Design a protein around this motif. Sequence first.
Motif, PDB file in Angstrom:
ATOM      1  N   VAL A  29       0.821  -1.207   0.000  1.00 15.82           N
ATOM      2  CA  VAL A  29       0.000   0.000   0.000  1.00 15.82           C
ATOM      3  C   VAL A  29       0.857   1.260   0.000  1.00 15.82           C
ATOM      4  CG1 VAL A  29      -1.763   1.273   1.262  1.00 15.82           C
ATOM      5  CG2 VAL A  29      -1.898  -1.217   1.108  1.00 15.82           C
ATOM      6  N   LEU A  30       1.846   1.331   0.886  1.00 13.95           N
ATOM      7  CA  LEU A  30       2.726   2.486   0.997  1.00 13.95           C
ATOM      8  C   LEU A  30       4.161   2.069   0.723  1.00 13.95           C
ATOM      9  CD1 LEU A  30       1.557   4.590   4.088  1.00 13.95           C
ATOM     10  CD2 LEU A  30       1.625   5.309   1.706  1.00 13.95           C
ATOM     11  N   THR A  31       4.838   2.816  -0.142  1.00 12.44           N
ATOM     12  CA  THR A  31       6.270   2.674  -0.352  1.00 12.44           C
ATOM     13  C   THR A  31       6.969   3.918   0.179  1.00 12.44           C
ATOM     14  OG1 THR A  31       8.022   2.318  -1.996  1.00 12.44           O
ATOM     15  CG2 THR A  31       6.075   3.544  -2.718  1.00 12.44           C
ATOM     16  N   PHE A  32       8.067   3.713   0.897  1.00 11.04           N
ATOM     17  CA  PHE A  32       8.773   4.798   1.562  1.00 11.04           C
ATOM     18  C   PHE A  32       9.980   5.215   0.734  1.00 11.04           C
ATOM     19  CE2 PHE A  32       6.542   4.838   5.606  1.00 11.04           C
ATOM     20  CZ  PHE A  32       5.944   3.595   5.624  1.00 11.04           C
ATOM     21  N   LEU A  33      10.068   6.509   0.434  1.00 10.12           N
ATOM     22  CA  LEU A  33      11.158   7.056  -0.363  1.00 10.12           C
ATOM     23  C   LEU A  33      12.170   7.834   0.465  1.00 10.12           C
ATOM     24  CD1 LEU A  33       9.019   8.422  -3.346  1.00 10.12           C
ATOM     25  CD2 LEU A  33      10.282   6.272  -3.282  1.00 10.12           C
ATOM     26  N   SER A  34      11.757   8.392   1.600  1.00  4.22           N
ATOM     27  CA  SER A  34      12.637   9.221   2.408  1.00  4.22           C
ATOM     28  C   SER A  34      12.209   9.151   3.866  1.00  4.22           C
ATOM     29  CB  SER A  34      12.625  10.675   1.924  1.00  4.22           C
ATOM     30  OG  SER A  34      13.462  11.493   2.719  1.00  4.22           O
ATOM     31  N   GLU A  35      13.192   9.151   4.764  1.00  2.00           N
ATOM     32  CA  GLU A  35      12.956   9.204   6.199  1.00  2.00           C
ATOM     33  C   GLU A  35      13.920  10.200   6.828  1.00  2.00           C
ATOM     34  OE1 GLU A  35      13.744   5.372   8.023  1.00  2.00           O
ATOM     35  OE2 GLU A  35      15.286   4.940   6.521  1.00  2.00           O
ATOM     36  N   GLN A  36      13.395  11.052   7.709  1.00  2.00           N
ATOM     37  CA  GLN A  36      14.188  12.096   8.346  1.00  2.00           C
ATOM     38  C   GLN A  36      13.818  12.190   9.818  1.00  2.00           C
ATOM     39  OE1 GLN A  36      14.185  15.845   6.182  1.00  2.00           O
ATOM     40  NE2 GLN A  36      13.861  14.803   4.222  1.00  2.00           N
ATOM     41  N   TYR A  37      14.831  12.271  10.678  1.00  2.00           N
ATOM     42  CA  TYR A  37      14.642  12.373  12.119  1.00  2.00           C
ATOM     43  C   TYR A  37      15.570  13.447  12.667  1.00  2.00           C
ATOM     44  CZ  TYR A  37      13.258   7.676  10.712  1.00  2.00           C
ATOM     45  OH  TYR A  37      12.730   6.601  10.037  1.00  2.00           O
ATOM     46  N   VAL A  38      15.008  14.388  13.423  1.00  2.00           N
ATOM     47  CA  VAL A  38      15.766  15.529  13.928  1.00  2.00           C
ATOM     48  C   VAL A  38      15.520  15.668  15.429  1.00  2.00           C
ATOM     49  CG1 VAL A  38      14.011  17.319  13.543  1.00  2.00           C
ATOM     50  CG2 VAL A  38      16.470  17.885  13.266  1.00  2.00           C
ATOM     51  N   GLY A  39      15.027  14.604  16.051  1.00  5.36           N
ATOM     52  CA  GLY A  39      14.682  14.653  17.457  1.00  5.36           C
ATOM     53  C   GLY A  39      13.336  14.014  17.715  1.00  5.36           C
ATOM     54  N   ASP A  40      12.374  14.797  18.200  1.00  3.52           N
ATOM     55  CA  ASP A  40      11.011  14.298  18.322  1.00  3.52           C
ATOM     56  C   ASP A  40      10.208  14.448  17.036  1.00  3.52           C
ATOM     57  OD1 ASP A  40      10.640  17.039  18.273  1.00  3.52           O
ATOM     58  OD2 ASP A  40       9.542  17.148  20.165  1.00  3.52           O
ATOM     59  N   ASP A  41      10.796  15.021  15.989  1.00  5.59           N
ATOM     60  CA  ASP A  41      10.092  15.268  14.739  1.00  5.59           C
ATOM     61  C   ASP A  41      10.442  14.198  13.713  1.00  5.59           C
ATOM     62  OD1 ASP A  41       8.402  17.693  14.852  1.00  5.59           O
ATOM     63  OD2 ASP A  41      10.275  18.680  15.437  1.00  5.59           O
ATOM     64  N   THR A  42       9.420  13.671  13.043  1.00  4.20           N
ATOM     65  CA  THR A  42       9.580  12.642  12.025  1.00  4.20           C
ATOM     66  C   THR A  42       8.903  13.105  10.745  1.00  4.20           C
ATOM     67  OG1 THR A  42       9.519  10.961  13.766  1.00  4.20           O
ATOM     68  CG2 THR A  42       9.308  10.205  11.496  1.00  4.20           C
ATOM     69  N   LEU A  43       9.565  12.887   9.611  1.00  4.45           N
ATOM     70  CA  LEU A  43       9.020  13.236   8.308  1.00  4.45           C
ATOM     71  C   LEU A  43       9.213  12.072   7.349  1.00  4.45           C
ATOM     72  CD1 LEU A  43       7.749  15.840   6.906  1.00  4.45           C
ATOM     73  CD2 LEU A  43       9.991  16.074   5.822  1.00  4.45           C
ATOM     74  N   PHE A  44       8.191  11.800   6.541  1.00  4.27           N
ATOM     75  CA  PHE A  44       8.238  10.742   5.540  1.00  4.27           C
ATOM     76  C   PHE A  44       7.795  11.295   4.195  1.00  4.27           C
ATOM     77  CE2 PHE A  44       7.541   7.926   9.325  1.00  4.27           C
ATOM     78  CZ  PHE A  44       8.755   7.276   9.253  1.00  4.27           C
ATOM     79  N   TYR A  45       8.504  10.911   3.137  1.00  3.72           N
ATOM     80  CA  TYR A  45       8.065  11.140   1.767  1.00  3.72           C
ATOM     81  C   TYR A  45       7.721   9.789   1.153  1.00  3.72           C
ATOM     82  CZ  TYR A  45       9.925  15.906   2.120  1.00  3.72           C
ATOM     83  OH  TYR A  45      10.182  17.204   2.496  1.00  3.72           O
ATOM     84  N   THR A  46       6.429   9.549   0.926  1.00  3.89           N
ATOM     85  CA  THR A  46       5.943   8.245   0.498  1.00  3.89           C
ATOM     86  C   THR A  46       5.107   8.401  -0.765  1.00  3.89           C
ATOM     87  OG1 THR A  46       3.847   8.220   1.719  1.00  3.89           O
ATOM     88  CG2 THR A  46       5.830   7.602   2.935  1.00  3.89           C
ATOM     89  N   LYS A  47       4.828   7.270  -1.410  1.00  3.77           N
ATOM     90  CA  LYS A  47       3.873   7.185  -2.504  1.00  3.77           C
ATOM     91  C   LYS A  47       2.714   6.299  -2.073  1.00  3.77           C
ATOM     92  CE  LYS A  47       5.798   7.067  -6.919  1.00  3.77           C
ATOM     93  NZ  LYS A  47       6.916   7.191  -7.896  1.00  3.77           N
ATOM     94  N   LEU A  48       1.494   6.764  -2.317  1.00  7.59           N
ATOM     95  CA  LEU A  48       0.287   6.054  -1.919  1.00  7.59           C
ATOM     96  C   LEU A  48      -0.355   5.422  -3.146  1.00  7.59           C
ATOM     97  CD1 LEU A  48      -1.769   5.322   0.293  1.00  7.59           C
ATOM     98  CD2 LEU A  48      -2.921   7.479  -0.196  1.00  7.59           C
TER      99      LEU A  48
END
Lengths: 48, 50
Positions: A29-48
């Motif tokens: 269902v979801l493929t993950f292209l990017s993951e970023q962690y800077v502390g308590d913050d999480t960001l994902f760049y995915t394709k749905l």
Amino acid sequence: NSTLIANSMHNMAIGTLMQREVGREQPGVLTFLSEQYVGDDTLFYTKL
Amino acid sequence: QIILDLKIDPGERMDPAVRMVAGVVGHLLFTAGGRFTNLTQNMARQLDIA
RNA sequence: UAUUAAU
RNA sequence: AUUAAUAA
């Protein structure tokens, strides 16, 4: 002395389990292209 | 009475060196013909490719 | 050190 | 408190 680094690595572990569990429960269902962690913050760049 | 096959997991992530070394290890660890076998034919094929 | 952006 | 960006 190592607050930010430890926080970000714990966030990385949480994101790793997040990816593994969403891959197990809903395969393809979801493929993950990017993951970023800077502390308590999480960001994902995915394709749905 | 018990034979082995390869498990495929999308969640698993590993260095390719592990697979290439297991290619060598499998030929020294298992029996694949003559009088009996420990492996399926697909498993032997994958070990040969590794 | 001074100011500011962030944690 | 901690790391940066300018000024001195």
